[PDB]
Design a protein around this ligand. Sequence first.
Ligand SMILES: [Cu+2]
Length: 124
Amino acid sequence: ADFEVHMLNKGKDGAMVFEPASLKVAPGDTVTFIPTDKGHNVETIKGMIPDGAEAFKSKINENYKVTFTAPGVYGVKCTPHYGMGMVGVVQVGDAPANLEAVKGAKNPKKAQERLDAALAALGN
Ligand SMILES: [Cu+2]
């Protein structure tokens, strides 16, 4: 299945957001990160990817399609706007084994506030 996440300068949750910021997909599903506004990219957050997965970092302004392979929770950020809280979470599959490990990862305050809310929206 294919899903879309939009990168926006402003949305319901404030400035510099991914919409949706919380998504559950099946293993092997694809998610396209779309540059609705210019100046954004997507990158995995250190300490927030599951075993067997590889980190990724898209280029500013590109439409980036990712096929999620290893199951688990992935924390993603926009590189230039990470300190402003532009982050999201993608859960791949049921019963993510790294869920408790991702909750302990360190992030700047504004990103942590939004990651905690996105993680809780998946069923904590
Ligand atoms: Cu951004």
